[PDB]
C-alpha cells in the first residue's frame, strides 16, 4: 500500500537562561525508526527499529552532524520569532517542524511535505508544488518574504524529491519483514448489568496492528448510530493497540445485539454477541 517517511522536530526554549532542548523523531510508515535528543547523556541519532542496526558508524555520525546544525537553526529561529511576536525569553516557547515524502504502492513519489508550527499553532507550510509558501499570520509573512528572497523552497524541493525518496526506498527494503507485518484483533464482549435490567454490552478489540479499526453494534442486522460509546484507540505498550465500543439500551434481551470488527489484518471480518 502507500508508504511514507517523516521527521518530526521540536525545539523547546528553556526559561532558566539555558539552551533549548531539541528532539528529532524519524518515522517510516508511521513507525518510529530513529531518534535524536539533545538532553541525552551523549546526544546522537539512535536506531529505534531493529532493521536500523545494520547502518554503519558513518551513517549515525552524519545524522548526528545534521542534528547539531538543526539545533543551531532552531536556536536562531527561536530568537527571531520572539522578536516578531514581542515575547520574553523568560518564558518557554515551542518550535515544531514536520517534513518528509509519501510514496504509492509502486514506491513512486506522491508528494513532498514541509510544515512548521510555533506555540502549537500553524506558522508556515510549503505548498504541494514545493515552490510557494503559505504563511499563517502577519508574523509568518516576514519569514515567507525572507525565504522567497533566499530561494529556500528550492533546497527543500531537492531533498523531498531526491534524498527523501531514495532513502525511504532503502528503508522499505531493509525493513521488509518488520514493515509488512499486521496483528489481527482478538475480540470479545463483556456485559455489565446497569440499573433497571438495562445491561451495557462492550465489544473489545485487542492486540491489533496497525491502529485503524472499525467496531460496530447491530440490532437484528441494523447498525446502531446513536447510543454507541466508542473509546479512542490506545496503545497496549507491546507495539499493539486496543479499542472498545459499548451499547447501553439492551435490557434482558441481549442476543438481538451483534458486534462487528473490521481490520486489514483479519482474514475475514469478525462477528460476536454472548452474555
Amino acid at each position: 500500500g502507500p508508504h511514507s517517511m517523516r521527521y518530526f522536530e521540536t525545539a523547546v526554549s528553556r526559561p532558566g537562561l539555558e539552551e533549548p532542548r531539541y528532539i528529532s523523531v524519524g518515522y517510516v510508515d508511521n513507525k518510529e525508526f530513529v531518534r535524536f535528543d539533545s538532553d541525552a547523556e551523549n546526544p546522537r541519532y539512535e536506531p529505534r527499529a531493529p532493521w536500523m542496526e545494520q547502518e554503519g558508524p558513518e551513517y549515525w555520525e552524519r545524522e548526528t552532524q545534521k542534528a547539531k546544525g538543526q539545533e543551531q537553526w532552531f536556536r536562531v529561529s527561536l530568537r527571531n520569532l520572539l522578536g516578531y511576536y514581542n515575547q520574553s525569553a523568560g518564558g518557554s516557547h515551542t518550535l515544531q517542524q514536520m517534513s518528509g515524502c509519501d510514496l504509492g504502492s509502486d514506491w513512486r513519489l506522491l508528494r513532498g511535505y514541509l510544515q512548521f508550527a510555533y506555540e502549537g499553532r500553524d506558522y508556515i507550510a510549503l505548498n504541494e508544488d514545493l515552490k510557494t509558501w503559505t504563511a499563517a499570520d502577519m508574523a509568518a509573512q516576514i519569514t515567507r518574504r525572507k525565504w522567497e528572497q533566499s530561494g529556500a523552497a528550492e533546497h527543500y524541493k531537492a531533498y523531498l524529491e531526491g534524498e527523501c525518496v531514495e532513502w525511504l526506498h532503502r528503508y522499505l527494503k531493509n525493513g521488509n519483514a518488520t514493515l509488512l507485518r499486521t496483528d489481527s484483533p482478538k475480540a470479545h464482549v463483556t456485559h455489565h448489568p446497569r440499573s433497571k435490567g438495562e445491561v451495557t454490552l462492550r465489544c473489545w478489540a485487542l492486540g491489533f496492528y496497525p491502529a485503524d479499526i472499525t467496531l460496530t453494534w447491530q440490532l437484528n442486522g441494523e447498525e446502531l448510530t446513536q447510543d454507541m460509546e466508542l473509546v479512542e484507540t490506545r496503545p497496549a505498550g507491546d507495539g499493539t493497540f486496543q479499542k472498545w465500543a459499548s451499547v447501553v439500551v439492551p435490557l434482558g434481551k441481549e442476543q438481538n445485539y451483534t458486534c462487528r470488527v473490521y481490520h486489514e489484518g483479519l482474514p475475514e471480518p469478525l462477528t460476536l454477541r454472548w452474555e
Partner: peptide, 9 residues
C-alpha cells in the same frame, strides 16, 4: 536520512 534546513525563520 534527515535534512539540514536553509534560511532561518
Amino acid at each position: 536520512a534527515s535534512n539540514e534546513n536553509w534560511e532561518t525563520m
